[PDB]
Design an enzyme around this catalytic site. Structure first.
Site, PDB file in Angstrom:
ATOM      1  N   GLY A  24       0.825  -1.210   0.000  1.00  0.00           N
ATOM      2  CA  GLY A  24       0.000   0.000   0.000  1.00  0.00           C
ATOM      3  C   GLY A  24       0.859   1.260   0.000  1.00  0.00           C
ATOM      4  CG  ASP A 139      -5.267   7.096  -8.202  1.00  0.00           C
ATOM      5  OD1 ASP A 139      -4.957   7.305  -9.404  1.00  0.00           O
ATOM      6  OD2 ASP A 139      -4.473   6.633  -7.361  1.00  0.00           O
TER       7      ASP A 139
END
Ligand code: NYX
Length: 339
Positions: A24, A139
């Protein structure tokens, strides 16, 4: 404390038998066995508390994902953190485990037209809910589309999301932007802050094109190169679309370019379904005011086998410094504490 690849991944005793998945923004992603629910789960480690921007995106996502409930949007099942603000260094977010993602799948797998159709349907179904809450994802890209072994799809990463603000969308030419370059709408480089829903539909168009050929459609290498990839396929904008861009630096940049012909979709994607390409054209429209909206996209003939507005739910309501942001992350995760 459990460890994986040298780092602490401190989620026990509930979660055991860790295996690495990937990375992440603020830490590692692992799967683990959940001893209470008796299923493997995904857990991502967030270490955000040194920075304003890390804290901002961590908190934005937590608030959004706890408020959202939808089959095509990843949820939060649990959040692990120390019991006090003083002791809290890392935060672990527990989520449903998903076998793969569309980025990984496109690297290795040809998609049938039926898989393309089903993935596109689920993306738009999820996006209908997000946009119904007056939220922009901002995104959307293959790596943010999770897939399980039966090809159920869930949208993830709400770190860049914003409440829509079309009245404050306008900006100048070449204004820097944060979201992933290859999936940026042409207007980002020209006159847009990315504060309208049309930003997300452009990214979905790019994802659809990428599903058709296993290759990104507009793989720009840098900020303005992205625009010239887009114009290379769509061709020069029309007079009317040019007249919509009032900002002179942006307008005159476009007027300075030689004429470029549109590349027909059926020449780029000779094996694609003709209805898929009609929808693709409408999502990859240069003028964001002319671009198809999510609910129109769902109603498009390409998706007629799945379209069912009664089964495409909307949100019940619109959605609305670092010491303070740590406190806010602490408060927002309190509901998962023993107590
Ligand atoms: C988009 C994103 O958050 N990716 C990381 C991730 C979240 C959830 C999940 N479940 N199985 C694998 C996963 C990866």
């Amino acid at each position: 404390p459990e460890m994986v690849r040298g780092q602490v991944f401190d989620v026990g005793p509930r979660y055991t038998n860790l295996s690495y998945i990937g990375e992440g923004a603020y830490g590692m992603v692992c799967s683990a066995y959940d001893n209470v629910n008796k299923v493997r789960v995904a857990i991502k480690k967030i270490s955000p508390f040194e920075h304003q921007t890390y804290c901002q995106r961590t908190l934005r996502e937590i608030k959004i994902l706890l408020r959202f409930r939808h089959e095509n949007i990843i949820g939060i099942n649990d959040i692990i953190r120390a019991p006090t603000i003083e002791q809290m260094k890392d935060v672990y977010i527990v989520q449903d485990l998903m076998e793969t993602d569309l980025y990984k799948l496109l690297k290795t797998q040809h998609l049938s037209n039926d898989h393309i159709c089903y993935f596109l349907y689920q993306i738009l179904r999820g996006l209908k809910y997000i946009h119904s809450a007056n939220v922009l994802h901002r995104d959307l890209k293959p790596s943010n589309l999770l897939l399980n072994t039966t090809c159920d799809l869930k949208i993830c990463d709400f770190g860049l999301a914003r409440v829509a603000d079309p009245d404050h969308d306008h900006t100048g030419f070449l204004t820097e932007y944060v979201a992933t370059r290859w999936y940026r709408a042409p207007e980002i480089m020209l006159n847009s802050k990315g504060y309208t829903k049309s930003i997300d539909i452009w990214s979905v168009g790019c994802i659809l094109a990428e599903m058709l050929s296993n290759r990104p459609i507009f793989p720009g290498k840098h900020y303005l190169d992205q625009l010239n990839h887009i114009l290379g396929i769509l061709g020069s904008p029309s007079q009317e679309d040019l007249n919509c861009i009032i900002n002179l630096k942006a307008r005159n940049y476009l007027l300075s370019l030689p004429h470029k012909n549109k590349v027909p979709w059926n020449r780029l994607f000779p094996n694609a379904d003709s209805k898929a390409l009609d929808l693709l054209d409408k999502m990859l429209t240069f003028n964001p005011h002319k671009r198809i909206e999510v609910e129109q996209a769902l109603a498009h003939p390409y998706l007629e086998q799945y379209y069912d507005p009664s089964d495409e739910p909307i949100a019940e309501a619109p959605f609305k410094p670092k010491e303070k942001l740590k406190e806010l992350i602490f408060e927002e995760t309190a509901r998962f504490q023993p107590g």
